[PDB]
Symmetry: D2
């Protein structure tokens, strides 16, 4: 036998950092869950139980904290590039570091119509994530995403004209509820190193904001018979607004709401144009994906 692939590190490292503005006294908090996986010349740990090549997972955790203490943790794309770069430069036998960061929302509270200097609320469970792969001699690859964004529109969605055969029972419809969770990823062009990433820093937060706004606006405004086409349109606009992006990927796990026929009860009318009360379904669910790139 032979070790074809190996990775190891620390997962679920919860980090919090506070920034205190020295002029205004305003504090800003950042909270994230970090995962670091290392690759390199570590085969002997598996074949011979040689631990000499192993950077303990505990030390990896310590390094996460130390790195967050000495550097900016935002935007996460930078933080991840800093953390990943550290391991490949500090250890000669380590050739790739894979950093994954989940950012949690802490939104400043508005109290009496003014933003409070140090109180926050966890508004959504929506996350902002980055996946950063730092590979010796192949620069830095970054994938940025938003996830756990949950939306619903009560009309202006249709579904008709789909294939029909002996497996088909679904009726075509010209007015339905469209609800879905939204996972959107945008892959950056490969970066040559840390210096390049740092010089593109302003683009990260701005592109996250664009992807989020385009997603919301297109979803709300598009009167469509095809969820597939709505997602392609979201992706086209993001690619048009940010040249440094190579691809956009969407994954929409639909959430179904069924009409409830109540006619058996005093001929009560609750279907079609009369549909008022629906039954949200927990499962199963339609899942629709696409990865869009540049022609």
């Amino acid at each position: 036998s032979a070790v074809k692939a190996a990775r190891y590190g620390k997962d679920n490292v919860r980090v919090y950092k506070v920034h205190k503005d020295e002029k205004t006294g305003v504090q800003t908090v950042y909270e994230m869950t970090v995962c670091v996986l290392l690759e390199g010349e570590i085969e002997t740990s598996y074949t011979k139980a040689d631990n000499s090549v192993i950077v303990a997972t505990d030390s990896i955790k310590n390094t996460i904290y130390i790195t967050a203490k000495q550097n900016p943790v935002t935007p996460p794309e930078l933080f991840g590039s800093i953390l990943g770069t550290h391991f490949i430069e500090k250890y000669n036998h380590i050739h790739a570091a894979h950093v994954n960061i989940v950012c949690h929302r802490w939104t400043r509270m508005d109290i009496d119509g003014k933003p409070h200097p140090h109180s926050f609320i966890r508004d959504s469970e929506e996350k902002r994530n980055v996946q950063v792969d730092v590979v010796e001699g192949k620069g830095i690859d970054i994938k940025s995403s938003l996830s756990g964004l949950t939306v619903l529109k009560s009309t202006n969605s249709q579904f008709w004209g789909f294939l029909r055969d002996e497996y088909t029972t679904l009726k075509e419809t010209w007015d339905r509820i469209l609800s879905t969770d939204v996972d959107a990823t945008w892959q950056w062009k490969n970066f040559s190193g840390l210096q390049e990433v740092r010089s593109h820093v302003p683009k990260f937060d701005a592109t996250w904001a664009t992807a989020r706004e385009v997603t919301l606006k297109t979803f709300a405004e598009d009167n469509s018979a095809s969820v597939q086409a709505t997602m392609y349109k979201m992706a086209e606009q993001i690619l048009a607004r940010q040249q440094l992006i190579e691809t956009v990927e969407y994954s929409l796990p639909n959430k179904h709401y069924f009409e409830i026929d109540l006619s058996w009860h005093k001929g009560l009318q609750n279907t079609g144009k009369n549909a008022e009360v629906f039954a949200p379904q927990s499962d199963p669910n339609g899942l629709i994906k696409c990865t869009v790139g540049r022609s």
Copy 2:
């Protein structure tokens, strides 16, 4: 052996309802999860295997849907009252209805600075709930609540002067992070029946909004040495703003964020004044509760 207590019904009934304004075209959606439990003369189902006294759980489900179709589903206090009343008024052997409702947020989207007529976002996992007990001859009991409200203040919280003894290692502190999940319940005065609840409809959303606003503003502004104290201040204010409220109950699960000493690494300072990087702890957690009522002192 005998049956001392019995209850049964349908749990986890998911319901959505949309309201459409013909005039404006504006649609409003509502979503919730409903549990209805029934009590009455039903011991025979246990003792003798007599199903003749049993209204099938499947039928309790249809009834929820039929009632949602025929009545306003908001405020939830109204709906649960309409729904529990139906059961004791339609089934002679049914003596009490316990209705639990969880309201999910579907908040209207603002697109390009304006409110969208029919798109919504789930802007938080915060819930608005009600527990309605409709008991034959004893009227309607209502507990209203908010839950899943998660907050953090990064400073202006202290904890010192507590009891110290041989089980104690906690150091006193004048500046710490205070984070918690808020659960607040306000118990209404008993209502005689449905018509009484109907007369007070407007107070329901109003008092939900006050309880929330009082919770946030107190948590943000209070410089308190005990969470116990901060919680008591919240309750006092809610009791003072709404007279139909008999008690306010708060339950606060503390979420700890520990300092991380990094001095073993070249003398790096990250504690006290110099603390910037913390470790949030998933468990264990402090848990603080209180039920606050009206005082019998006339002055």
Copy 3:
């Protein structure tokens, strides 16, 4: 306003304890999650911000570890009585202690037909719990329980003869799947003190084993058209076999399996007597409870 009730303490304290036999070399592990809430003369911490009456929740945590260190952690009924008593005896202004204990399963592995001395597997998410209320001057109240036990029987469950009116659509049946999670709780007669708890120590594990066995057997063997009667039969047998028990409470959250009609597709027969493939429903679910006492 006035404080009507107040309680506070430490929740979610995870505890693991190992027992090592020096002769046999066999090891035994216990894992649980503990919650301790205290009551007493603590009003002024709410009303006057007076912390002098506050035993820090952090010191409650220390006390749990210290207590597990110096005492037996099994049966949890005993352990919880010890932990609750300690607080009302150590602090003058504390007059009630509420202890909740969740025990997790670590079942000894069997390797090559033989029980391994020190390897364990989590063989189920089923829990053994205790709730112990130690109230000064009023003894010790113990509720024991099992939860998270999920069962299913493929036939020999019926449901007919139920009330039918204009809100009914359910068709009666004489054959159906019965699946449910089981929550069973047995309330011990009040104990005057720790000495009395200590003298009945052997009764606890045995009653739990009895409660578990009675539950599975009756569930498996009963061919009933009433889940209510089935659980009433369960309670009777437990009450009969253990005199120190005052009440038995069952909570059965049903799990529905719907028949799927496929006759639109080539005359496929999959209903009634021909039903083979079912759709498990995630929600909603029937919920049935009862508390059974002695005449």
Copy 4:
């Protein structure tokens, strides 16, 4: 812009199936959660909002139900293969079907020391899964796995000799608790079509029984200072025992149990050799992987 990848289908389809023996009267239940994603000439649903190319996800659902009624649902490697093949044989424009199946446990109850004919218990949360890729003109790729298998060993685990630098605080140890959730996957050699898969049916269940037993035994008996070396010994045995397997992949998320220093309290000794009471840590956790192939 161009569609670079696209896939869509139905997720979280819950399926239950009962097998009744008329002779013996003994029943056997299977329950699983299925996901089917399709790929093909479907770009136009995205670019042109053309649904005529869309096999409705609702019909994909129907199909999984009809397929389960008409065929054996065990072993899952077989069922997955039949279901994936169906799409590429029925539709001109679909060239790949990706089927994921998660099997849940329904273990036959032993009542009075005899197997019960129609009563089951969900012993563990452990799963047996399959991922089948059926791609037009490229055969059928099957990956089998077990997951959610949780184990603990109270001694006979060590960790010393790792790299130590200015980021390292972990002390070396010769006796510690080792606990993990296990995820093991084995990838079969490419199968040419359904008939060849059908020909190896017996091997599927047997290879799953083997991977499970090797994982438990090696974990229980190995006294290693390397989780890495233990997992490598596991993969070796599996590869040695099944020639039709190309690779074995293990993913082990460590679950740490910290020692609690209690000496500050009246000199209590609960460290090193006196350690009896530990604190289970929910996060963070080490995560170790490797993929082991043949030389």
